[PDB]
Amino acid sequence: HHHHYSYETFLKDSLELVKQVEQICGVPEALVCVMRGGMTLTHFLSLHWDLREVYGINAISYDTTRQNALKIENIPTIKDHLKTILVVDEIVDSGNSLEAVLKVLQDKHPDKKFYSASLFQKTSAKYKADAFLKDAPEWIDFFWEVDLKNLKSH
Amino acid sequence: HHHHHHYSYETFLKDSLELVKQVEQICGVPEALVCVMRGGMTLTHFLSLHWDLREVYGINAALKIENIPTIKDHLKTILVVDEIVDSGNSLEAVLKVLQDKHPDKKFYSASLFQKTSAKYKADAFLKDAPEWIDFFWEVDLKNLKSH
């Protein structure tokens, strides 16, 4: 029931995500990483595609004890000559964060085409990424979340 | 010419715990991170999760500094994260632009590797950089794709 998503599984999945992205939009011209969860994935993908145009955007949930919890911050200003953009995240749960990221990116950059890719996606998500690899299990620990604290404690 | 050094994932985990300890000694747990993209991305991801920090900003790098973040007013202790400092020109210029823009904040810098000959050195670094070192985030996929 408890899945540890390991670095080795991530390498294999990253190569498959590359294949699946190239099939829909070709090689992207730039990446937007949905911080924090997309950072390691976007680092590996940007080096694989030899892409230096990498931008970040933050999706952060705050306590509504406020009108809306989710808040999208640090909106990048993508350069004019970049038109095919891949937005990268590691898991899509409800889809609310990714949908909000795309909506702001498209509003600010109406000339560009944004595609989205995730490693994992809940089947019941209200909003889904253009490309995803695996249905999200109920309970999942990612190596970037747990390996450093597990090493420290052993 | 130069011998081939390589930085694996397992080495990165052990060194990241040491980097955490040394940053904590110098400035405490940071209130926010600035990742020097691309090379700091994986490191900053792991550090932000370890310290439960959601305030993570990016910046990219003669040459000009691009995509300069605007850091929230209340965040005072900021850690700038890179994986290697070679000449030191990029890190020096990143710090210059951040400090000019946010003069009331305290910026500290950390890197895994640091050239001994660099003109500018990070406040915290763990290892001397050899002439040729490659990193798991650069090479592991290409090897896996080969096999």
Structural domains in chain B, CATH included, are 5-146 (3.40.50.2020)
3-state secondary structure (DSSP) of residue A34: strand
Resolution, angstroms, 1 dp:
1.5
> Within 10 A of A22 (CB to CB), how many other CB atoms are there?
13
Q: Which of B141, B131, B132, B138 is nearest to B41 (CA)?
A: B138
Q: Output Rg (C-alpha) for chain B, integer angstroms.
A: 15
Contact of A152 with B17, CB cutoff 8 Å = yes
Strand partners, A33: A56, A88
Q: Which residues of B29-41 are buried (b: 16+ CB within 10 A; e: fewer)?
A: ebbbbbbbbbbbb
A140 interfaces chain B, CB cutoff of 8 Å: no
- Number of other CB atoms surrounding residue B70 within 10 Å: 10
Cα(B141)–Cα(B136) distance, integer angstroms: 8
Point out the residue among B9, B17, B41 whose CB comes nearest to the CB of A43. B41
B18 touches chain A (CB under 8 A): no
Beta carbons of B58 and A60 less than 8 Å apart: no
Q: Do A56 and B38 touch (CB under 8 A)?
A: no
Q: Is B108 on the interface with A (CB under 8 A)?
A: no
- Contact (CB, 8 A) for B5 and B128: no
Distances (CA, A) of A34 to A62, A86, B36, B45: 16, 10, 16, 11
3-state secondary structure of A143: helix
- List of chain A residues whose C-beta atoms are within 8 Å of the C-beta of residue B35: 39, 56
Q: Helix, strand, or coil here: B105?
A: coil
Nearest residue, CB atoms, B56 vs list A36, A47, A151: A36
Q: Is B62 in the A-facing interface, judged by CB distances under 8 Å?
A: no
Does the bond joining A36 to the residue before it have cis omega, within 30 degrees of 0? yes
Q: Judge whether B101 is closer than 8 Å to chain A, CB to CB.
A: no
Closest CA to A30 of A107, A105, A82: A82
What was the structure determination method? X-ray
